[PDB]
Design an enzyme around this catalytic site. Sequence first.
Site, PDB file in Angstrom:
ATOM      1  N   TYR A   1       0.774  -1.162  -0.039  1.00  0.00           N
ATOM      2  CA  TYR A   1      -0.011  -0.204  -0.055  1.00  0.00           C
ATOM      3  C   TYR A   1       0.737   1.128   0.022  1.00  0.00           C
ATOM      4  O   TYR A   1       1.866   1.292   0.767  1.00  0.00           O
ATOM      5  CB  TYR A   1      -0.866  -0.228   1.170  1.00  0.00           C
ATOM      6  CG  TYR A   1      -2.083  -0.578   0.917  1.00  0.00           C
ATOM      7  CD1 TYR A   1      -3.249  -0.376   0.327  1.00  0.00           C
ATOM      8  CD2 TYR A   1      -2.045  -2.142   1.716  1.00  0.00           C
ATOM      9  CE1 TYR A   1      -4.286  -1.367   0.137  1.00  0.00           C
ATOM     10  CE2 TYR A   1      -2.887  -2.974   1.352  1.00  0.00           C
ATOM     11  CZ  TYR A   1      -4.229  -2.455   0.703  1.00  0.00           C
ATOM     12  OH  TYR A   1      -5.199  -3.501   0.464  1.00  0.00           O
ATOM     13  N   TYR A   2       0.203   2.333  -0.746  1.00  0.00           N
ATOM     14  CA  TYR A   2       1.187   3.518  -0.811  1.00  0.00           C
ATOM     15  C   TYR A   2       0.269   4.675  -0.395  1.00  0.00           C
ATOM     16  O   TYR A   2      -0.787   4.597  -0.189  1.00  0.00           O
ATOM     17  CB  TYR A   2       1.368   3.701  -2.527  1.00  0.00           C
ATOM     18  CG  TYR A   2       2.317   2.954  -3.028  1.00  0.00           C
ATOM     19  CD1 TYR A   2       3.721   2.783  -2.809  1.00  0.00           C
ATOM     20  CD2 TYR A   2       1.827   1.551  -3.477  1.00  0.00           C
ATOM     21  CE1 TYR A   2       4.618   1.906  -3.148  1.00  0.00           C
ATOM     22  CE2 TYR A   2       2.651   0.488  -3.986  1.00  0.00           C
ATOM     23  CZ  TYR A   2       4.232   0.741  -3.995  1.00  0.00           C
ATOM     24  OH  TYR A   2       5.021  -0.382  -4.238  1.00  0.00           O
TER      25      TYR A   2
END
Lengths: 177, 163
Positions: B32-33
């Site tokens: 996840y960013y």
Amino acid sequence: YEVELKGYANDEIFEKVRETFEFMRKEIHEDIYYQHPCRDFSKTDEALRIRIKRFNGHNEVFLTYKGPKIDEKSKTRLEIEVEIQEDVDKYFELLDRLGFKEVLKVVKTREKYYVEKGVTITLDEVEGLGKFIEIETLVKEKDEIPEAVEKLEKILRELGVEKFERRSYLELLLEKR
Amino acid sequence: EVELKGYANDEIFEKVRETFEFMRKEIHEDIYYQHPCRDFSKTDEALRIRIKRFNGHNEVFLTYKGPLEIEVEIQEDVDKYFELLDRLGFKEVLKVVKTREKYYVEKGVTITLDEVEGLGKFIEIETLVAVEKLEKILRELGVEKFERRSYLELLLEKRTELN
């Protein structure tokens, strides 16, 4: 790094290339350049583009990030490029959702010519700008760029190129907005 | 995409395997960013690269989740996508690893049994159009606690409370 040099051209330079080098193929390019949602790429000298390349009934699409120019004598820069093999529209949608907004669309035709191993010349007819000629070759180390630039500049000058341009077509078109 | 999630356990997992048709087992690593300037945790958005392994091979996907979903498959150069994201200012927030078993319930309805590393067992159900229908299905399986928060959100909350 992909060492690249560009110069303004004309029918004369174009013809000389056609009579000097092996023709590879002609491509139509439709590029969409984007602005970053948080920083001004024009200030950081970065670029993000989606390119649609058309040739021989084929269509190829690429997403390319370009880093700042690292050479004063050329347009050489770090590049990260991936090919969009499907769902082109999704990439357009993804960029939009992430806040990347289209700055401008650059359209051109590009005739590619083989110069020597690993060296290619392109005759560009850019909509809204005119004729240009580009030359490129790959080098492994940054310190090898100067030599390559000299080599490529010589090839272009021997073809009649007099005025070189480190500004991208995007930058040139933006100036005329 | 109507989806619901609930806390599960071995018993719930077992009931699913005995009741529905197994479709596929997959192992996932979701990276996840965080957005370069929008706080996705405040805008209810997400961007992740999912690397899945199943049937002796890996598949990679880049997916955006709106506050409603854009997903594309990365067939090659995933390392370049990681680099592109880094260059554009997206930073890894957390990597969520889980094993997932997918089951067919009925026409247009699927269930997933998720074993999330660092969190535990969860059961998800999804269909396209419905909530009360999926809700009833999960409740009959023994699910008593639902969860709208994503695994990412849960892992982050867990880390914050633990420290």
